[PDB]
């Protein structure tokens, strides 16, 4: 079960995102791993015993981001928000990491992901601690209990799906729900060239995985600052060769567990996207960034 939140002004891009994440979570598990973590991974953790799966590299990327955010006396954490909560591992990970945090909220516009989130959280006995909302990032102001501000927010691989307009409005409303000194942990995928210069290695005529709203490091950071957040740390993470590795391991998973008949269309987009983006990553035209931001 999830609660519904509508802001009477619906984003026209929702349909494209819903389509992307519609399909059987068991097919996604075969592509990206059992944890269903969908924002890359690091292959440099001394704890990782090769071969390193997308489950291991994803987990260790999150650990590294938690370290950079200073959660290795981290201050009060009584309420957590996961923006675009995917298939719910992010909320489970934070729940286990913050056992004295009684409230974690997840927002998502994919009903199929939220259906899987509830069943998955229930199996791990977190249903009371974790609340799920069918809620666009731009209606975060409508989330219940504005009298209880968020201490920690994750936005990992979500801003890639935002039009510039949506991104600016969402971050302004997110900022308004933060306690002073609250941390925002961001992962996203940004183009290191001017947008006019960049040319897709493999022509994208179908908008692969609803990621057409490309952004630069400069603009990305400008928006966080304009909403009154302080950028504490911004860096390439994972490294280009690690994002490429994740992509190509996921491509291999898809080509090894599916045929062109049975493959769900979004996993076909991901299979093609893997070579295109990996080439762009090798050429340093594209990087995944870790951003730690705080409310002053």
Ligand X SMILES: Nc1ncnc2c1ncn2[C@@H]1O[C@H](CSCC[C@H](N)C(=O)O)[C@@H](O)[C@H]1O
What does 183-194 look like in DSSP terms, one character per residue?
A: EEEEEEEEESS-
178 and 295 Cβ atoms separated by less than 8 Å: yes
Rounded (10°) angle between helices 111-123 and 25-32 = 80
Pick out residues in 152-211 that bind ligand FPP (CB under 6 A). 157, 160-161, 189, 200, 204, 208-209, 211
Residue nearest to ligand X (CB): 84
Closest distance of CB 135 from ligand X, Å = 7
Binding site for ligand X (CB under 6 A): 11, 17, 21, 37-39, 84, 86, 90, 107-110, 113, 136-137, 156-158, 161-162
| Candidate residues 112, 214, 257, 294; the one interacting with ligand FPP per rule CB under 6 A | 214
Q: How far apart are CA 55 and CA 134, in angstroms?
A: 26
**Residue bearing tokens 């102001």:** 141
What does 42-89 look like in DSSP terms, one character per residue?
A: -S--TT--SS--HHHHHHHHHHHHHHHTT-------SEEEEES-TTSH
Binding site for Mg ion (CB under 5 A): 204, 208, 211-212
Nearest alpha-carbon partner for 38 in 98, 119, 108, 123? 108
What does 276 interact with, of ligand X, Mg ion, ligand FPP, none (CB < 5 to 8 A by kind)?
A: ligand FPP
Closest distance of CB 195 from ligand X, Å = 20
Beta bridge partners of 155: 186
**Residue bearing tokens 């567990």:** 257
Closer Cβ to ligand X, 8 or 203, answer by number = 8
Closer Cβ to ligand X, 210 or 263, answer by number = 210
Closer Cβ to Mg ion, 141 or 207, answer by number = 207
Q: Is 215 exposed, middle or buried (0-12, 13-18, 19+ CB in 10 A)?
A: buried
What does 148 interact with, of ligand X, ligand FPP, Mg ion, none (CB < 5 to 8 A by kind)?
A: none
Q: How far apart are CA 165 and CA 112, in angstroms?
A: 26
What does 190 interact with, of Mg ion, ligand FPP, ligand X, none (CB < 5 to 8 A by kind)?
A: none
Closest distance of CB 91 from ligand FPP, Å = 16
Beta bridge partners of 61: none
Closer Cβ to ligand FPP, 77 or 293, answer by number = 293
What does 186 interact with, of Mg ion, ligand FPP, ligand X, none (CB < 5 to 8 A by kind)?
A: none
Nearest alpha-carbon partner for 20 in 270, 271, 284? 270
Pick out residues in 254-283 that bind ligand FPP (CB under 6 A). 273, 276-277
Pick out residues in 44-83 that bind ligand FPP (CB under 6 A). none
Closest distance of CB 23 from ligand FPP, Å = 15
Closest distance of CB 61 from ligand X, Å = 9
Q: How many helices (H) and strands (E) does the chain have?
A: 9, 8
**Residues contributing to the site for ligand FPP (CB under 6 A):** 38-39, 157, 160-161, 189, 200, 204, 208-209, 211, 214, 273, 276-277
């Amino acid at each position: 079960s999830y609660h519904v939140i509508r802001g009477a002004e619906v984003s026209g891009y929702e349909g494209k995102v819903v389509y992307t994440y519609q399909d059987d979570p068991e097919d996604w598990r075969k592509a990206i791993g059992d944890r269903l973590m969908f924002q890359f991974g690091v292959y440099d953790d001394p704890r990782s015993r090769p071969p390193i799966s997308p489950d291991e590299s994803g987990l260790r990327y999150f650990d590294r981001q938690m370290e950079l955010a200073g959660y290795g006396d981290f201050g009060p954490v009584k309420r957590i928000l996961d923006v675009g909560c995917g298939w719910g591992f992010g909320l489970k990970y934070l729940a286990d990491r913050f056992p004295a945090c009684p409230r974690l909220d997840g927002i998502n516009i994919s009903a199929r992901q939220l259906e899987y989130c509830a069943k998955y959280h229930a199996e791990h006995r977190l249903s009371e601690r974790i609340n799920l909302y069918l809620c666009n990032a731009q209606d975060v102001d409508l989330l219940p209990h504005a009298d209880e501000p968020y201490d920690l927010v994750t936005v990992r691989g979500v801003i890639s799906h935002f039009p510039n307009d949506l991104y600016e409005r969402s971050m302004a409303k997110l900022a308004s729900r933060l306690r002073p000194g609250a941390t925002v942990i961001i992962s996203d995928n940004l183009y290191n060239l001017p947008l006019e210069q960049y040319r897709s290695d493999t022509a994208d005529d179908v908008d692969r995985l609803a990621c057409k709203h490309r952004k630069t490091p400069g603009y990305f950071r400008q928006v966080l600052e304009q909403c009154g957040l302080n950028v504490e740390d911004m860096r390439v993470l994972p490294e280009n060769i690690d994002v490429a590795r994740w992509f190509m391991d996921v491509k291999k998973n898809i080509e090894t567990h599916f045929t062109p008949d049975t493959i769900p269309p979004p996993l076909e987009e991901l299979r093609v996207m893997a070579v295109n983006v990996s080439v762009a990553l090798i050429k340093d035209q594209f990087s995944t960034y870790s951003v730690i931001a705080r409310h002053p």
